[PDB]
RNA sequence: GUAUCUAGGACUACCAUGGUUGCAACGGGUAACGGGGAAUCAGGGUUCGAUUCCGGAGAGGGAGCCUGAGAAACGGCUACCACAUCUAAGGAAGGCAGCAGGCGCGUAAAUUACCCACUCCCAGCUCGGGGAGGUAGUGACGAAAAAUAACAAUACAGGACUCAUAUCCGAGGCCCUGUAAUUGGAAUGAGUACACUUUAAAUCCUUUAACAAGGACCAAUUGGAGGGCAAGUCUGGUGCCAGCAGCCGCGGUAAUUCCAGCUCCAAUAGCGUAUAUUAAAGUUGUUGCGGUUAAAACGUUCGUAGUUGAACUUGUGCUUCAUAC
């Protein structure tokens, strides 16, 4: 059944695995490496960007809300992003077309919750660390 | 759709905002591990409560 | 306290000690402290020495 | 470099962070030995494994083997000098019966409390911080000194310590001045 | 044969038609310097190695070459290209992937400090030189050690305890335990600073005279409390809204998830978040997967490569001692 079970078949055993790790869906970001092709930043971790709009992405069914996201154009490459700003409020902390450090969204490439197809998350807007703004633990830059 | 974002941060605007102001600045590392012994042993002698939970309020 | 180890170098005579005598390490009981530089400006006078030949007596006015 | 600050990372975090009985065991150590943080207990627990993974490996060598002795009993030289194994159960099979608590019972935080110098399960534990403990010449600030069994008898007090009686306050001696002045 | 330090198609001359590959030649890709090694599990392994040591290359680009024992050198020169400077306009000069810097780029990287005292290198040299090397400032990349109280009666109740009396019950209760901005006793070092020491010099640590805690003080945080998964069916607000949420799900007007408050939990000078990677993964499987129906046996057979191929060809006897008994 199956394997080349000889003792002088380690050529077939390595050329088989070499040809059949392509069907390991997650080891096709070692092989074909589409990171520099399909990721919005060229394989990095974070990204500085410049906000272009305020997109009210509505929630997917069977949850009704409106997620209040933000459409970023970066400065790294001139890709486009629809990022996301969490924890209610803090669209009031945007002060539009002022720069943003967006980040990955923790499901490694997919949208997470009821957000349809939005893959990112604001972590710093105008360099003041948004988690230190719901408490207003640091001062918002206003003037 | 994007019908309105004009209700962003709504329930924070409907919050009464009472305060903390007190509560007795607590013991840190080693002494904090001292203080987590009375809250187990004797209170709570594992008496029969007929399938209940220990850190309950009511 | 009660333990403080160290080194001790009993020479024979001071003038025979006046041969070996690590001077920067002698300098604690050095009676012989000379020629302050202090090693950052001596380069700058050396580099200007390279641009005058033969006499090298014009860099009194350069600091 | 070069060789920059060569690792030996202790502090083994466990696999699953909230296994309820694993959590109900740690405070059954902290009351026994007045330890501060929990990764102190993972510090000593990691020390047992490098013993055992050395210990259990020797039992896969077919006695007589050269490796099973000059590394074998040399482990057992340490485990009796540390004051943990007895002399009857000297052999390599019995070293695997060492619970975590047996290393903890040679901590200075218990070897000053099992001696009468301390009278409390935490006054021991802070006495070593404030330097009133001598080991044969040397005062020791660190309570994780773990005591070898040869140096058991020399746990006594510092001479410059207020116990037994050198500059006994000295803040209390200033408190012996602020009352009269 | 020429050239080279030298072999050599290294090159020229004639002559031969050879070489190479399914055991992957040749071309392509590389977010490729190679190794020592690093990460991570029980094994088997995947992943990483620009980076201190070794070997190699390069000094904006390509090319060229002098001096030399040694350089196709760039803190040598020569062109050209690019970039750029001082120019009185004729000319002249540029090379930080050395150190410390400055601009840029970006999510992402320190001070234009000190010293040759160390390690060693160098010259004519014991002495000179050496931002090599060393010191220092910066520095939660990292790794180690460990400060946030300790003790005491009353205390305020639980509990044994002696005992009344017992489905009750109290007192002699008490080793205990907590609560006590009750009371104390206060035990000490972060501070603190003479002077020391350390050092090239100076600092840091260690010693240190003086100075240093009733907390309000010398005052830990960061994440969470539906499940996974440790820990409130606590109160108020909001009512499919705001939000939460990795996954499964909560909110559609009594929210165990939302905004809070009280509480509570987990680690703790540490913790959250992202991407990456590894283990979980017997979900890449040689050890070790699966293929009737869940994904998966070519329509059939033939067949080179390859893989894999039955049996048989000096084996115990026989006697002894060394040798277990």
Brief overview, please?
The structure is cut from a larger assembly and holds chains A (143 residues), B (58 residues), C (63 residues) and D (181 residues). Chain B is mostly helical and 58 residues long.
Outline the secondary-structure elements.
This is part of a larger assembly, with chains A (143 residues), B (58 residues), C (63 residues) and D (181 residues).
Chain B: H1 29-34, H2 38-41
Chain C: H1 14-17, H2 23-26, H3 42-49
Chain D: H1 20-30, H2 39-58, H3 67-70, H4 72-81, H5 100-104, H6 108-111, H7 123-127, E1 134-135, E2 138-139, E3 155-156, H8 171-178
Antiparallel strand pairs in D: 1-2, 1-3
Chain A binds one RNA strand of 325 nucleotides through residues 2-13, 15, 17, 20-21, 23-27, 30, 33, 35-36, 39, 41-48, 59, 62-68, 75-76, 86-89, 101-108, 110, 112-114, 121, 123, 131.
Organism (chain C): Drosophila melanogaster (Fruit fly)
Region (Disordered) (chain C): 33-63
Protein name (chain C): 40S ribosomal protein S24
Plain-language structure description:
Chain C: Residues 37-63 have a biased composition (Basic residues). Chain C: This is 40S ribosomal protein S24. Chain C: Residues 33-63 are annotated as: Disordered. This is part of a larger assembly, with chains A (143 residues), B (58 residues), C (63 residues) and D (181 residues). Chain A is 9% helix and 20% strand. Chain A is mostly beta strands and 143 residues long. The longest helix of chain A has 9 residues, at 12-20. Chain A is elongated and about 75 Å long. Chain A starts with 11 loop residues before the first helix and ends in an 18-residue tail after the last strand. With 58 residues, chain B is an all-alpha fold. Chain B is built from two helices and no strands. Chain B has helices at 29-34, 38-41. The radius of gyration of chain B is 22 Å and the shape is elongated. Chain D has 181 residues and is mainly alpha-helical. Helices cover 37% and strands 3% of the residues of chain D. Chain D has eight helices and three strands. Chain D has a three-stranded antiparallel sheet with strand order 2-1-3, with no helix packed on it. In chain D, strand 1 and strand 2 (138-139) form a beta hairpin. The relative contact order of chain D is 0.09. The interface between A and B is small, with 12 and 10 residues. Chain A binds one RNA strand of 325 nucleotides through helix 1 and strand 4.
